[PDB]
From Swiss-Prot:
<feature type="binding site">
    <location>
        <position position="45"/>
    </location>
    <ligand>
        <name>a carbohydrate</name>
    </ligand>
</feature>
<feature type="binding site">
    <location>
        <begin position="75"/>
        <end position="76"/>
    </location>
    <ligand>
        <name>AMP</name>
    </ligand>
</feature>
<feature type="active site">
    <location>
        <position position="118"/>
    </location>
</feature>
<feature type="binding site">
    <location>
        <begin position="116"/>
        <end position="118"/>
    </location>
    <ligand>
        <name>AMP</name>
    </ligand>
</feature>
<protein>
    <recommendedName>
        <fullName>Ricin A chain</fullName>
    </recommendedName>
</protein>
<feature type="binding site">
    <location>
        <begin position="190"/>
        <end position="192"/>
    </location>
    <ligand>
        <name>a carbohydrate</name>
    </ligand>
</feature>
<feature type="glycosylation site" description="N-linked (GlcNAc...) asparagine">
    <location>
        <position position="5"/>
    </location>
</feature>
<feature type="active site">
    <location>
        <position position="75"/>
    </location>
</feature>
<feature type="glycosylation site" description="N-linked (GlcNAc...) asparagine; partial">
    <location>
        <position position="231"/>
    </location>
</feature>
<feature type="active site">
    <location>
        <position position="175"/>
    </location>
</feature>
<feature type="binding site">
    <location>
        <begin position="3"/>
        <end position="5"/>
    </location>
    <ligand>
        <name>a carbohydrate</name>
    </ligand>
</feature>
<feature type="binding site">
    <location>
        <begin position="136"/>
        <end position="141"/>
    </location>
    <ligand>
        <name>a carbohydrate</name>
    </ligand>
</feature>
<comment type="function">
    <text>Acts as a glycosidase that removes a specific adenine residue from an exposed loop of the 28S rRNA (A4324 in mammals), leading to rRNA breakage. As this loop is involved in elongation factor binding, modified ribosomes are catalytically inactive and unable to support protein synthesis. Can inactivate a few thousand ribosomes per minute, faster than the cell can make new ones. Therefore a single molecule can kill an animal cell.</text>
</comment>
<feature type="active site">
    <location>
        <position position="172"/>
    </location>
</feature>
<feature type="binding site">
    <location>
        <position position="10"/>
    </location>
    <ligand>
        <name>a carbohydrate</name>
    </ligand>
</feature>
Length: 258
């Protein structure tokens, strides 16, 4: 599978931007774009040899871990660190079979008894996304935590928090230019901070926004979607137009209308 590399060592806004652009390029094919927004490959009929992409992360501590992402939804399905690989609990038989095609050369394969969804990860981490700092520092530390898990150097709560960090800085950033922007700001000023309401609400609404845009009538939503500003105030989205500068990738829901 295609591999994209990124290192927190000496990371800059430009290196991070190039990385995210590369991830998006491997996630989508360019065959599906609606209202100027690219759509991820339809899972139905997708050959297994095109199902995943690998993101190899390295840090200043000279440690590396490789995340495996599902191209149909940008979900992080597992990772490899040295001679060991860990996968989140598959949601169905199709997915369980699919992951057997990842990291086939690793000596030790493990499948977590829990899923990789935020609700579960936050529960294990003992903290909600709104209380977990993001930035280059948190990412560098998350890479180390993931790397030392197999040897008992990392506790479950810390492992869960580390996944939460990686998922947002890689997958959510790939999904939303807005979130990518927020991560760029953190890198530019070397600051770590938890995601504000605008970030959390976008992450939580990705599925709904994808469906709303795809089922829209010429771009107009049948029912408005509520999002939050940075200060937590609510505002409604009635059209795809206002989201073009915000969302970079959508999960496939249905075929586009004629």
């Amino acid at each position: 599978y295609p591999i994209i590399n990124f290192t927190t060592a000496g990371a800059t806004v430009q290196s991070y931007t190039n990385f995210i652009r590369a991830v998006r390029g491997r996630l989508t094919t360019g065959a599906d774009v609606r209202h100027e927004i690219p759509v991820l490959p339809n899972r139905v009929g997708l050959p297994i040899n095109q199902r995943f992409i690998l993101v190899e992360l390295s840090n200043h501590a000279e440690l590396s871990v490789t995340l495996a992402l599902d191209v149909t939804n940008a979900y992080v399905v597992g990772y490899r660190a040295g001679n060991s690989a860990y996968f989140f609990h598959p949601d169905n038989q199709e997915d369980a079979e699919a992951i057997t095609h990842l990291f086939t050369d690793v000596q030790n394969r493990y499948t977590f008894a829990f899923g990789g969804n935020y609700d579960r990860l936050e529960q294990l981490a003992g903290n909600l996304r709104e209380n977990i700092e993001l930035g280059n520092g948190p990412l560098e530390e998350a890479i180390s935590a993931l790397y030392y898990y197999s040897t008992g150097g990392t506790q479950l709560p810390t492992l869960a928090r580390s996944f939460i960090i990686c998922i947002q800085m890689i997958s959510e950033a790939a999904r939303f230019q807005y979130i990518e922007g927020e991560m760029r700001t953190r890198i530019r000023y070397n600051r770590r901070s938890a995601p504000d309401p605008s970030v959390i609400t976008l992450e939580n609404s990705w599925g709904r926004l994808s469906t709303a845009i795809q089922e829209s009538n010429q771009g107009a939503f049948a029912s408005p979607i509520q999002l939050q500003r940075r200060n937590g105030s609510k505002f409604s989205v009635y059209d795809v137009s206002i989201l073009i500068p915000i969302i970079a990738l959508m999960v496939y829901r249905c075929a586009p209308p004629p």
